[PDB]
C-alpha cells in the first residue's frame, strides 16, 4: 500500500510488497500520464529513488508518500 502525489495534488494510490524493484512501479505510474518518465523523477523523503533501488534497500513505510517532480531547466 502506497501513494505517489505529484507536483500538484493527484493522489494515485498504489500497492506492492517491499522487496522487488521500484522500476516496475515507475513505468506503472508513467503509464497513465501526459508526458513520459524522464520528464519526471521519483523522490522519497528527499533521496531520489533510483531504478536499481528497492523498497527493501529503502526502508519505506507502507502507506507512505513517494513524491514526483518534473524536470527543471534554466539558462
Amino acid at each position: 500500500k502506497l501513494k505517489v502525489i505529484g507536483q500538484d495534488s493527484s493522489e494515485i494510490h498504489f500497492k506492492v510488497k517491499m522487496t522487488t524493484h521500484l522500476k516496475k512501479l515507475k513505468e506503472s505510474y508513467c503509464q497513465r500520464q501526459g508526458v513520459p518518465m524522464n520528464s519526471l523523477r521519483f523522490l522519497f523523503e528527499g533521496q531520489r529513488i533510483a531504478d536499481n533501488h528497492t523498497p527493501k534497500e529503502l526502508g519505506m513505510e507502507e502507506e507512505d508518500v513517494i513524491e514526483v517532480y518534473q524536470e527543471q531547466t534554466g539558462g
Binding site: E27, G34, P36, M37, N38
Partner: protein, 156 residues
Amino acid sequence: ADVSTFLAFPSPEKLLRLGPKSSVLIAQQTDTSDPEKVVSAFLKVSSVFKDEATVRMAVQDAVDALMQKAFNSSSFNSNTFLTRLLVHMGLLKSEDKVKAIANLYGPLMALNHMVQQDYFPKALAPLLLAFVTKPNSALESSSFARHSLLQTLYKV
C-alpha cells in the same frame, strides 16, 4: 505488453525493436473513442523522430496506422483532436499575445528612443545588439512550426 512498455517512455530503438508489426500494433492498442488518448499516442510515437530513415519511416507508417484506424470511426471528433494537438504544440494558446504585445508598445517605444539619444553610452549599443543576437533571443520555436505547417498546407 511490448507496446505499453514503449509508450511509457519511447525510444528510437524501442520502436524499432517491435519490427514491422509495431505499426498496427500501436494503432490497435490505442482506443480512438476519445480524441485525447489518440493525440496522447500521436505524440509519444512522433516524439521519437530523428533524422534517420529507419526511425523516420517507422514513425510515419506508424502514425498512418493510428490515424487511419482513427479517422474510420464515428466516435471520433477530428476537430478536437486537431485542436488539442495544436495546443500541445503550443501553436495555439500559450500566451495572451494580444496583451503581450500591448505591453511592449511602451517599453519598446522607450527603449528604442533611449538607444538613439546622445547620452546613450556608445559602448552599450554593441552590447545590446550582441545581446538580442544570441540564440535564446533569436531562435523562434512555434513561430517556426507554424510556418512549416503552412507551407505544406499551401501544397508547396
